């Protein structure tokens with residue numbers, strides 16, 4: 001009934017069923033995170049001069065991954081910019097729903113956009129790796145003991161010179177609960193370099209245009225993979 005309820009119950013399934021708790025959550029329609037749109041900071045960054053640095057350096061094979069994509073708004077958005085984009089969720093339900101939601105999209109028709117039931121930690125990183133990965137409500141969905149493997153995986157998935165964009169949310173302080181887990185740029189930083197040797201944090205801003213409930217709980221951070 002209430003979002004507070006859906007969260008409490010979602011955390012109940014997580015404790016009972018682990019990562020399998022996600023496909024049931026999607027099937028039962030317990031999806032309090034789902035907004036129906038990309039977060040505004042993502043579009044604003046991309047249409048910035050800072051983000052137009054990214055999209056004009058793209059080759060024609062520029063590959064985006066959106067892990068934990070849910071109904072895949074963010075994956076759709078990147079596809080429309082010409083990026084050959086993969087949206088990956090653990091839950092086939094979520095990824096069927098994404099296929100419906102985006103059924104009319106020219107990118108889904110043309111294959112430029114693509115949804116696929118994958119375990120972020122398990123699937124075969126392709127030979128060419130990814131030029132761009134976008135993490136939103138994925139890092140904060142993970143239990144704390146999965147933040148280092150998250151970071152280690154991020155290191156293999158992004159080719160050197162690639163970009164990892166992390167909309168860090170929710171920055172809620174000490175909230176001792178999850179999902180969604182209270183995170184901050186420091187928790188992301190530690191996970192990404194297990195003074196930091198695998199990434200440079202090129203840009204770390206508070207977006208000018210957050211969703212109203214995101215205001216003051218959110219920072220866009222852009223990481224460059226370096227070797």
Ligand SMILES: Nc1ncnc2c1ncn2[C@@H]1O[C@H](CSCC[C@H](N)C(=O)O)[C@@H](O)[C@H]1O
Pocket residue numbers: 019022023033034035067068069070071072088089090091094118119120121136137138141
């Ligand atoms: N190992 C894993 N691999 C891929 N997806 C995972 C995963 N563990 C959890 N997830 C998925 O990450 C999502 C957490 S919430 C959905 C977040 C989505 N990015 C959005 O903005 O709507 C769920 O869809 C869950 O199925």
